[PDB]
Amino acid sequence: ENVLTQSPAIMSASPGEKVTMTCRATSSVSSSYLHWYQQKSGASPKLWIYGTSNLASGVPARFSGSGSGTSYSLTISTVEAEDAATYYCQQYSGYPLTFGAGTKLEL
Amino acid sequence: ENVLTQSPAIMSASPGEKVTMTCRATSSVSSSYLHWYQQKSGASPKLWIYGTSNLASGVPARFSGSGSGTSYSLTISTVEAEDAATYYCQQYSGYPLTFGAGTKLEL
Amino acid sequence: ENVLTQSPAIMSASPGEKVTMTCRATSSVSSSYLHWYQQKSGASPKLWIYGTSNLASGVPARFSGSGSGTSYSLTISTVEAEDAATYYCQQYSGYPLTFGAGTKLEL
Amino acid sequence: HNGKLCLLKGIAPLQLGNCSVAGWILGNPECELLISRESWSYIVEKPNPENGTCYPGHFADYEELREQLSSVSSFERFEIFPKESSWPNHTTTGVSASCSHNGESSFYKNLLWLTGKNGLYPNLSKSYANNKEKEVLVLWGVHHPPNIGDQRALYHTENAYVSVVSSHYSRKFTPEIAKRPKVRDQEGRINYYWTLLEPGDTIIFEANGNLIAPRYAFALSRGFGSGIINSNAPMDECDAKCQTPQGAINSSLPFQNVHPVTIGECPKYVRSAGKEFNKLERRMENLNKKVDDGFIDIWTY
Amino acid sequence: HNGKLCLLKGIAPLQLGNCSVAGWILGNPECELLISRESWSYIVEKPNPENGTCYPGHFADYEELREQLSSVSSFERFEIFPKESSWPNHTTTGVSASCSHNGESSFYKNLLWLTGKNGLYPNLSKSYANNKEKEVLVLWGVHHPPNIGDQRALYHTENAYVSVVSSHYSRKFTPEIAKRPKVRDQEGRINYYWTLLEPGDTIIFEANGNLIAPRYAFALSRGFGSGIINSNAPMDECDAKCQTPQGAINSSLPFQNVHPVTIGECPKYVRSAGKEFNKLERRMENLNKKVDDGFIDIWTY
Amino acid sequence: HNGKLCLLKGIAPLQLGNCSVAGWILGNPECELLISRESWSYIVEKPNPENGTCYPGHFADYEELREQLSSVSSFERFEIFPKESSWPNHTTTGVSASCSHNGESSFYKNLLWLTGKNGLYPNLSKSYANNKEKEVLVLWGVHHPPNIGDQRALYHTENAYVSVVSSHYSRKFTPEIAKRPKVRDQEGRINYYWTLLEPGDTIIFEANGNLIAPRYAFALSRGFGSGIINSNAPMDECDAKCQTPQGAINSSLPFQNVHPVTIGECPKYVRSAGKEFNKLERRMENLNKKVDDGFIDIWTY
Amino acid sequence: QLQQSGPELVKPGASVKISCKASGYSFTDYNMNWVKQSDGKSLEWIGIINPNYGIISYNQKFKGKATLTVDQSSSTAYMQLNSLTSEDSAVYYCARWGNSPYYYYYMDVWGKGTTVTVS
Amino acid sequence: QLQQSGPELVKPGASVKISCKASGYSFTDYNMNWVKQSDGKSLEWIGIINPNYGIISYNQKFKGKATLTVDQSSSTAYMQLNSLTSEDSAVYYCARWGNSPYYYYYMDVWGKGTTVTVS
Amino acid sequence: QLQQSGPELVKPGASVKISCKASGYSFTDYNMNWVKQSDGKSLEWIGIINPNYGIISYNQKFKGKATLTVDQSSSTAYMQLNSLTSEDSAVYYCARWGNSPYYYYYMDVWGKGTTVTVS
Questions:
Q1: F287 closest CB neighbour out of D168, D170, D291
Q2: Which residues get glycosylated (chains D, E, F) (predicted)?
Q3: Does A87 touch chain H (CB under 8 A)?
Q4: Contact H30, H97 (CB under 8 A)
Q5: What is residue F221's DSSP assignment?
């Protein structure tokens, strides 16, 4: 049943800038089972948040997260041009583990 | 032994307005055992907070709560004239489960 | 291995004033095992925080704490001249339980 | 055979009738305190006595308690904890409809359904030291109420526990809030527990809740020449050195054909003209049966 | 002696061959449903049959199940829970390579490796009431997967539990995520559990996960004149009132010298020309052995 | 009878004297390593030896260990885990005053009171695989310290656990911080645990804390013709095929009247001129006693 | 929901009984409160009856002056006032302790209240 | 890390198999995902194979159109496309559910993706 | 509270013993720390004695140079300095690890400290 929408579709930004992007679930999701993946230019994505707030290895502290139930948030204190990419939100609400179509950074 | 006092005795307010009202306990109360009931014009009250922060069914998200030990708080982000009423605080500290005499909204 | 540094070395302040002092650990420390001791003029110190936030008996609420991992904080909402002293931070990271050389109040 | 529940040596049996060993010890309300019978030659049990535990539940190690009481020949039913003055901060007068006795409600006579006083159930730590120089049979219970509401109205705690400790016996209980089907008009159960307690040993009770605490306890003379006979028959006074469930035996022969479970200076069983176990002890029963059966053949050469 | 696995009264044994009592009851895939043999005079077991539990794990109270089935002489292998229509919100078609049968994978025929459907494993509460007026042998299992990944891909919960309740049997399981060494190509185990269930009694299953739920269950006639013989020998049809593992006996003498474990109207064991226990029951075995040995002397005067 | 603790076949007994089987195996400090006596005809125990477990606590399944060692006739006391080089990140030199030996303190010789090194107690996972082709008796312990202070000064964790695993034995322990009454000058206890470990089987130890880890362990030849005699008597060298606790027997008759617990090519018990159990096994004892008693009658026709 | 007896008028000293009965849930499962409320005044906890086990408990203000009981079959609770006086002229509610883990002693549903009056 | 088969070109209807093999970890321990990604489009969960127990599960969008399997010895996973059509011209990844307490259903490492193309 | 030995003056190399004894609590239950403090300088953890089990542990800075022990009956702890030198001229405290769940390794009470001095 579940499906997620995340915003903004594309962000315009500047280096040295703060952002938060949002993933909203059509049905409830536990904060223990939502996750965010880095993805650049058609390469293999990368896991950069793995607990709605917990940060993976290889990703700076800047990256942060929060939320509950049907709304969740990824947050950056500082974006940099070569660090920015598309970000994909993911969850478990039963199967499928459908992702949210990635938001994109034009930075 | 326990007895509670809550404030204000009466609130004057306007629709579209934020408020927080306070219940103070003469003796300690666990945050898991304090509760708040809606009550209008001598009708049967209604349970609108049931965990110091947890919200019952049939009551909007606006209603919120917080606190610990000897001090607890009910909070509204927006009051509306037909939604407002007297609010009664309640606890367990052993028996009796004496309530706090209800605060009243003149709105 | 572990050793801690805390700051400031000395604080100049006024009565009725707020402060926070910091203890940083060269290696990780659980928030459940860091502690802060009052110490005046070469007398026997006293335990005034015992859980990174928890307050001991005989010390007012003003005294507060926070932190995690490698950084921790003691905080006062109001200093008073006869209440102020040197403050020593302490931890367990295995042994030794080496303290941080006390910060000092010139107040 | 004499056909009656005679007396072995003039010392009289104990008649539980509609009581059972399970209820006897727990002090079933529909049952005398049986203070009149703190000594006997044998216990008498009906095949399936109706009024045993007035409250439903599982009587832990029941089949072992029956056996250790089989040898026993006397008690001393002391108030190991007086109902008054032992529990000033607990309500001791709990009762249940299931345990009715000439009235709407009561409770067992050898236990106390401790519940909160002033809405408070303080973590108790009562303890007792066996200064009576003889083994003490302690009984208690843990209540598995059928819902959280009853749990928190009686004991006022959700994650409740019980703990029982003595020199060589420690057990901890977390009772489950299980809505079991109604039995004797009640859903939640009372799992009953027993321990012996050696001379000079001390037993420590602790509980955040759900303790069906002990009121009385048996400082009991372990004795010999006893056992739980089971049979239906008259209780008229009569004399013979040996009792069997359907009757006593006078020594015409040292041979018996009557029901195995036997007490006294009794002849030997044959077929030529009392222990029990639960289901997870079939091995043990086929042992006992086999143990019995072979001897029973050997006895008839 | 006749040297063959004869028939006691024309009623035929049960031949598990490369099956074992552990797998028989669990319905080992490399084994007939044995519906053909829902009645017998005796079970036949090879000394160490290779294909018992196709999946590794510890069969709780195995040595007791063997004994309670020793007396049994018939089943009624009913689908206590139909594979379809009993578990609409669970995947029932779980299989493992360890349990291969003429193919890459299968699973036991008397259990269902319940796993999530649509990635959901809803807290189940299935229950069954023994309206068959005879005792019901229920079997289930709890899966101890070798890692959290397998746990959460099958059952989708980490702190999983199982719970089984009936009038006088309650047990709760929290299975451990233990990376045991490979056996039959598999690491995690399946601890298997069994309970009898009295007439009119009802059994309640509950689980957040890790339940290897029951499909079938034996409403079994407890009977007598049965037992688990163990021996390797031909199964040819032949007649005598008594069987022993190496052969039947015709009554030339009431004396037997053949292997102890005996079934039928059998002579007595001597040496002059079936129970088991685990390691923490050596006392019990030396009991049985002693029990046996003494009789075996007594029989040869 | 000869009145002395003779030798059965020239092979000498084991004399624990003021030691006990509980301490012997644990290696009681006030007791030789008894490496001198890794083979015997029988163990000798005094009625109530004072210096058994130098540290107070409950020796789990003690009454079963005694029985499995009754059959044993030899060990191989190997250092299943060398004190050095097995625990580089643990302090192995823990000692207690209760276990004094010619000095203020020591500890058992077959266990290691592991405590933290550098104030760290790392989650250990030591394991050992029985490549010795004979069963291995492993012993360990879990410490129930009398307060949180001692717990966290030794093991540095509060919610501590232990876990022991092998092919067909898994147990997990959470020890309780109980301020028990002083015994042998110490409050907290050391619950002692034992398991046999089959050839080729492997045992896995795991612990966040409170592990009284194994140093040595007995790869033991299960043997026969052994047992734990209990008696007080001289140990002078003398010869006869049969020993009884008060003396050996030369074959004048195959009849014995001496204390039941007997070892060797011994005559039969009569009255006409060694197993044990705990309190929750009275049924089992009355079995054994009954088992004995009947034979004892049968033997005197 | 909960349904209740009707308004009542009495003289002092005349003992009187209020009732309230459940519907829409298993009566035996959830605990019964009783709560006075004088007109526009504070409203206060009389005491509970645990329907299943008959374990009453009272507020010592009301102990004796009130007595609580229940009938399973009727799915009903009853509250008796003894030795009435003028200040008992008020609205008496009965209520229910809803069941939930980790939170409890709330009153999630209420009867419509009975005006028992002294004059 | 994960390594994958190479790019492929095919006509419609011609079934085709992708592979990916592990290194640097115990293959059998961690669960295998498969995930489509059309060019610059959404990327979506095909389904998992649990290497240890062969417990497959699919997204009902792909059920049947895809089939998943594994080989322990090769430390390899395989994904079969049946009845291909044009919109299957995309990058297929395989991935791994890393193991952690209290958090799970994340995909901590990815193969480099295979462009399977229909023309 | 804790009570302590008196100030002391000594030459180098002369080993010396400090003591501190408890009152107002069960001595055996709570663990004993020892802690140096030079005049106005840092103050540092010598090591602990666990009164009940005699499980000492030291800071490797002081290992050997200090030795700790206790007497149950006297409710007393003792600290021995071996091979003294000038920089040991300081205030030595003994302290106690108060017992609490989930928090520990704090020192909730202190002796008044002994000035042991080298000259």
A1: D291
A2: 18, 51, 89, 250
A3: no
A4: yes
A5: B
The alpha carbon of H87 is separated from its chain's Cα centroid by a whole number of angstroms, namely: 17
C94: Cβ contacts below 8 Å, ≥ 6 apart: C1, C2, F116, F118, F119, F120
State phi, psi for G73 to the nearest 5 degrees: -60, -45
From chain H residues 34-63, the ones with a CB under 8 A of any chain E CB are 48, 50, 52-55, 57
The vertex-G5 CA angle with G2 and G11, nearest 5°, equals 145
Residue F157, strand partner residues: none
Resolution of this entry, Å: 3.6
Domains in chain B (CATH in brackets) are: 4-105 (2.60.40.10)
* Angle subtended at Cα D165 by Cα E176 and Cα D76, rounded to the nearest 5 degrees: 140
> CA torsion H73→H74→H79→H81, rounded to 10°?
-110
Residue H30 in contact with partner chain E when CB distance is under 8 A: yes
Q: Which amino acid is at E246?
A: Q
Distance CA D166, CA D201 (A): 7
Rounded distance between C-alpha atoms, residue B83 and residue H62, angstroms: 50
To the nearest whole Å, the CA of E139 is away from the closest chain H CA by: 22
Q: Are F198 and F138 in contact (CB under 8 A)?
A: no
**Residue D150 CB coordination number (10 Å):** 24
Measure Cα distances from F259 to F7, F70, F230, F256 in Å: 17, 17, 9, 9
In chain B, alpha helices (H)? none
Q: Give the closest-approach CA distance of G22 to chain D in angstroms.
A: 16
Q: Mind listing the domains of chain H with CATH numbers?
A: 2-118 (2.60.40.10)
H helix or E strand, kind and range, residue F290 = helix F282-298
Which tokens belong to E153?
A: 């891909």
Amino acid identity, position H91:
V
Q: Taking a contact as any Cβ pair under 8 Å apart, which residues of chain B between 21 and 60 contact chain G?
A: 32-33, 35, 37, 42-47, 50-51, 54, 56
Chains D and G are in contact, defined as 3 or more C-beta pairs closer than 8 angstroms: yes
E15 contacts: CB under 8 Å, gap ≥ 6: E5, E37, E44, E235
Q: Other CB atoms closer than 10 Å to residue D189's CB: what's the count? A: 24
From the number of C-beta atoms within 10 Å of its C-beta (0-12, 13-18, 19+), residue I26 rates as exposed
CA A33 to each of CA A49, E157, E208, G110, I44: distance values in angstroms, whole numbers, following the listed order: 11, 12, 18, 39, 45
Take residue E237 and report the two structure tokens written for it.
């049809």
**CB-count burial class (<10 Å; 0-12, 13-18, 19+) for G102:** exposed
Domains along the sequence of chain E with CATH = 14-219 (3.90.209.20), 239-298 (2.10.77)
Do E154 and H53 meet the contact criterion of CB atoms below 8 Å apart? yes
Are chains C and G in touch, 3+ Cβ pairs below 8 Å? no
SS3 I27: helix
CA B72 vs CA A99, B95, E215: distances in Å: 41, 19, 53
Question: Do residue E282 and residue F67 have CB atoms under 8 angstroms apart?
Answer: yes
Q: Does D284 touch chain F (CB under 8 A)?
A: yes
Cα(D57)–Cα(D61) distance, rounded to whole angstroms?
Answer: 13
Given a contact cutoff of 8 angstroms between Cβ atoms, the answer to whether A19 and A27 are in contact is no
Q: Are C29 and C90 in contact (CB under 8 A)?
A: no
Closest-CA residue to D61 (of D113, D138, D165, D134):
D138
Tell me if H52 and E187 make a contact (CB, 8 A cut-off). Answer: yes
**Residue of C28, C91, C95 to mutate when probing chain F, most F C-beta within 10 A:** C95
**How distant is the Cα of D179 from the closest Cα of chain G, in angstroms?**
10
| Cα F221 from chain centre | 15
Q: What are the phi and psi torsion angles at E40 (to 5°)?
A: -160, 175
3+ Cβ–Cβ pairs closer than 8 Å linking I and E: no
B17, B78 contact by CB (below 8 A): yes
Give the burial class of C10: count Cβ atoms within 10 A of its Cβ; 0-12 exposed, 13-18 middle, 19 or more buried: exposed
